[PDB]
Amino acid sequence: GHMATLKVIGVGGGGNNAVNRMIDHGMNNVEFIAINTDGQALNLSKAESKIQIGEKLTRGLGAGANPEIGKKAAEESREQIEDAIQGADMVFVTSGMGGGTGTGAAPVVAKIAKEMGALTVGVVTRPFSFEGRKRQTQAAAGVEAMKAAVDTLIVIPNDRLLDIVDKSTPMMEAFKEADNVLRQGVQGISDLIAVSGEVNLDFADVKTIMSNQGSALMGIGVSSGENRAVEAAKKAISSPLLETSIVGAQGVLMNITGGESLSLFEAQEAADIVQDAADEDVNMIFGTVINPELQDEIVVTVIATGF
Ligand SMILES: Nc1nc2c(ncn2[C@@H]2O[C@H](COP(=O)(O)OP(=O)(O)O)[C@@H](O)[C@H]2O)c(=O)[nH]1
Ligand SMILES: [Ca+2]
């Protein structure tokens, strides 16, 4: 055996910027892979592994808003993509839908990951409405192709970022908020793999919840004090940036981490928050971790599928 190998793959411009920001944030025990047609951008990537696709197609330029070029680029470079993926137990593919490279290449990358045996999760954005109808239609086709290629898919409509900014919030700060969805999803899985919990969840439970499902939610909530478990649970399933909310989820992996004070009653409260918000008879895979380093803080991690 071995400790489950996680890789995060950015595809196209937005995907590679997300990768750069995650690397800078400080994510460890995860392999980052940068994939792009655009050689200028790739040269500035902080990823250990860089794959320039479509060298013969684009000659180092981007795909110029043509998803067919992105797709053919990924197909041209299938063997480099396979080699980069090799060894992964789980692959996260992140990309902004609507352009030429991500829209076409990301679903090929996802297909390669899955056909190689990796549990494959996509986290992708839809374009802002101000970008126009063609962009939205191209992105929609990209989303549908991603859905057909991944085990689970998380979609972030960029329009939702307009819900969390004020008129002065810098664009890059809004982009960082979107980054949180993938980054915390990855970190929650990394944490599950690395610690043997008092009620343990491991990579086999992640596979059960995420394999061949469709839409997904991945969230984390942290709270302290009086109603900390309910508050943390509510935060975990809060989805202002998510196309897919908790509502309708029929399978949930939920892990609760706390100090020695973590109460049985609290654990039930948190479970009930998730079950009630889903408004379904949820099949739960429940975990608990006692970290005595923690004091009054409680952390609730949720992965929801089965929509
Ligand atoms: N949230 C977010 N969205 C992005 C970012 N970069 C690009 N986008 C979105 O992604 C779409 C495609 O852009 P890009 O990834 O550069 O295109 P590509 O390189 O040709 O695949 C754009 O239409 C934007 O909606 C980013 O850093 N954050
Ligand atoms: Ca564990």
The neighbouring-strand residues paired with 36 are 52
Q: For residues 304 and 307, what is the distance between their CA atoms, to the nearest angstrom?
A: 8
Q: Which domain holds residue 38?
A: 1-212
C-alpha distances in angstroms, 236 versus 138, 164, 221, 231? Answer: 31, 17, 4, 9
The single-letter code of the amino acid at 4 is A
Residue 260 CB: number of other CB atoms within 10 A?
A: 9
Residue 199 CB: number of other CB atoms within 10 A?
A: 12
Q: For residues 57 and 53, what is the distance between their CA atoms, to the nearest angstrom?
A: 9
Residue 24: helix, strand or coil by DSSP? helix
Cα angle: 252, vertex 255, 258; to 5 degrees: 155
Q: Do residues 161 and 52 both lie within one domain?
A: yes
DSSP class per residue in 128-139:
PGGG-HHHHHHH
Q: For residues 303 and 230, what is the distance between their CA atoms, to the nearest angstrom?
A: 17
Instruction: Provide CB contacts within 8 A for 63, sequence distance 6+.
Output: 12, 37, 54, 69, 70, 73, 99, 100, 101, 104
C-alpha distances in angstroms, 293 versus 24, 193, 194, 261, 262? Answer: 26, 19, 16, 11, 13
Instruction: Provide CB contacts within 8 A for 249, sequence distance 6+.
Output: 217, 278, 280, 282, 304, 305, 306, 307
Q: For residues 255 and 227, what is the distance between their CA atoms, to the nearest angstrom?
A: 17
Measured in angstroms, how far is the CA atom of residue 178 from the centroid of ligand 1?
12
177 touches 147 (CB < 8 A)? no
Q: Do residues 165 and 244 both lie within one domain?
A: no
The single-letter code of the amino acid at 181 is V
Number of helices (H) and strands (E), helices first, in the chain? Answer: 11, 11
Q: Do residues 19 and 120 both lie within one domain?
A: yes
With a 6 A CB cut-off, is 14 part of the ligand 1 pocket? yes
How were these coordinates obtained?
X-ray
As annotated, the binding site includes 13-17, 21, 63-65, 100-102, 131, 135, 158, 179
Looking at residue 273, which CATH number applies to its domain? 3.30.1330.20
Q: What are phi and psi of 301, to 5 degrees?
A: -110, 135
42 touches 67 (CB < 8 A)? no
**What tokens were used for 104?**
């076409």
Measured in angstroms, how far is the CA atom of residue 272 from the centroid of ligand 2?
22
**What tokens were used for 93?**
């593919």
What is the DSSP-derived secondary structure letter of residue 127?
P
Q: Do residues 63 and 183 both lie within one domain?
A: yes
Indicate the pairing of strand 90-96 with strand 49-52: unpaired
Taking CA atoms only, the protein residue closest to ligand 1 atom 11 is: 96
With a 6 A CB cut-off, is 287 part of the ligand 1 pocket? no
Indicate the pairing of strand 297-305 with strand 251-258: antiparallel
The single-letter code of the amino acid at 73 is A
Q: Do residues 59 and 144 both lie within one domain?
A: yes
Specify the resolution in Å.
1.7
- Counting from 1 in the atom list of ligand 1, the atom nearest the Cα of 156 is 1
Instruction: Provide CB contacts within 8 A for 98, sequence distance 6+.
Output: 126, 127, 131, 135, 136, 138, 139, 142
- Counting from 1 in the atom list of ligand 1, the atom nearest the Cα of 17 is 27
Q: Give the max Cα distance, the chain.
A: 61
User: For residue 240, which of 165, 146, 150, 133 has the smallest C-alpha distance?
Assistant: 165
98 touches 127 (CB < 8 A)? yes
Taking CA atoms only, the protein residue closest to ligand 1 atom 25 is: 127
As annotated, the binding site for GTP includes 13-17, 21, 63-65, 100-102, 131, 135, 158, 179
Q: Do residues 151 and 283 both lie within one domain?
A: no
Among the candidates 160, 189, 212, a domain finishes at: 212
Residue with tokens 């126009």: 132
Among the candidates 212, 238, 263, a domain finishes at: 212
- Our count of domains for the chain comes to 2
The residue to mutate among 36, 125, 164, having the most atoms of ligand 1 within 8 angstroms of its beta carbon, is 125
> Please, what sign has the CA dihedral across residues 108, 62, 53, 35?
negative
Instruction: Provide CB contacts within 8 A for 25, sequence distance 6+.
Output: 179, 183
Looking at residue 1, which CATH number applies to its domain? 3.40.50.1440
Q: For residues 236 and 231, what is the distance between their CA atoms, to the nearest angstrom?
A: 9
